[PDB]
Amino acid sequence: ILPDSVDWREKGCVTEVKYQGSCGACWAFSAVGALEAQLKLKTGKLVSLSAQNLVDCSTEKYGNKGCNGGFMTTAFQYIIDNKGIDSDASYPYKAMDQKCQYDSKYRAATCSKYTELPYGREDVLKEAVANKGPVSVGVDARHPSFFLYRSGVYYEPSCTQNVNHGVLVVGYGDLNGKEYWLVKNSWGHNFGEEGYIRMARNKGNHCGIASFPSYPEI
Numbered sequence: 145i146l147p148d149s150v151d152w153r154e155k156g157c158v159t160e161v162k163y164q165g166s167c168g169a170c171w172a173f174s175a176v177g178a179l180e181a182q183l184k185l186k187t188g189k190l191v192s193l194s195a196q197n198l199v200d201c202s203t204e205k206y207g208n209k210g211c212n213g214g215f216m217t218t219a220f221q222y223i224i225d226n227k228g229i230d231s232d233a234s235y236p237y238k239a240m241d242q243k244c245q246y247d248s249k250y251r252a253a254t255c256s257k258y259t260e261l262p263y264g265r266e267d268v269l270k271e272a273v274a275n276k277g278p279v280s281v282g283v284d285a286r287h288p289s290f291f292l293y294r295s296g297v298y299y300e301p302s303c304t305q306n307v308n309h310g311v312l313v314v315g316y317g318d319l320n321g322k323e324y325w326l327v328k329n330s331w332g333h334n335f336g337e338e339g340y341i342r343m344a345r346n347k348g349n350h351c352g353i354a355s356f357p358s359y360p361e362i
């Protein structure tokens with residue numbers, strides 16, 4: 145049995161909403177967001193981790209292209225391989241590609257492994273969000289309705305399972321029956337519901353939200 149609703153923000157495991165700007169670092173923000181929750185669960189400290197660190201260092205060897213896109217899974221592997229990731233405070237976000245400047249003296253977190261959930265299974269995603277923590281996912285955000293979203297449960301008839309935008313599921317619930325996934329975006333606090341968007345849940349893997357989910361562990 146799983147809870148009917150979950151919101152990790154209530155558990156102090158979600159940091160402030162970030163603004164990626166003109167740099168396509170959605171994947172980096174999604175990855176750090178997922179790890180930030182695990183760091184809190186392990187150490188009791190809520191610390192924003194360096195998305196810039198991923199943009200600058202989890203590059204070609206990880207199939208990533210910095211401000212031109214990347215993967216949350218390979219970002220997690222970089223953190224594992226690198227034996228650490230710096231704090232956002234020590235390695236701030238500049239919304240541009242930079243030479244890798246990682247330094248272990250600024251290490252704020254580590255990662256031991258990551259898990260990729262089975263394709264399109266919203267029930268498995270629900271269990272992971274309830275029992276493991278926030279989960280990194282990809283969604284189809286190639287529709288004007290996504291950019292124009294303001295509030296309520298988002299549903300786009302033209303959505304597909306071809307995802308292109310990396311975000312973070314930090315909970316789930318229902319708005320007057322309409323089930324949804326609580327998503328933390330990285331487009332600033334002025335987007336949607338102050339940085340978040342509630343997306344249709346149990347509506348046939350709407351916008352591919354359950355297509356490629358993954359979460360790290362410490």
Ligand SMILES: *[C@H](N)C1(NC(=O)[C@H](CC2(C)CCCC2)N/C(C)=N/S(=O)(=O)c2ccccc2)CCS(=O)(=O)CC1
Nearest residue numbers: 168169170171212213214215281282307308309310356
């Ligand atoms: C993010 N700001 C940006 N998208 C990505 O970086 C994108 C995120 C995904 C779709 C990767 C897997 C989950 C989230 N990364 C990549 C590499 N996408 S892809 O088109 O090569 C892809 C691979 C596998 C499955 C689906 C798609 C927004 C869109 S962008 O401006 O084109 C690049 C940055």
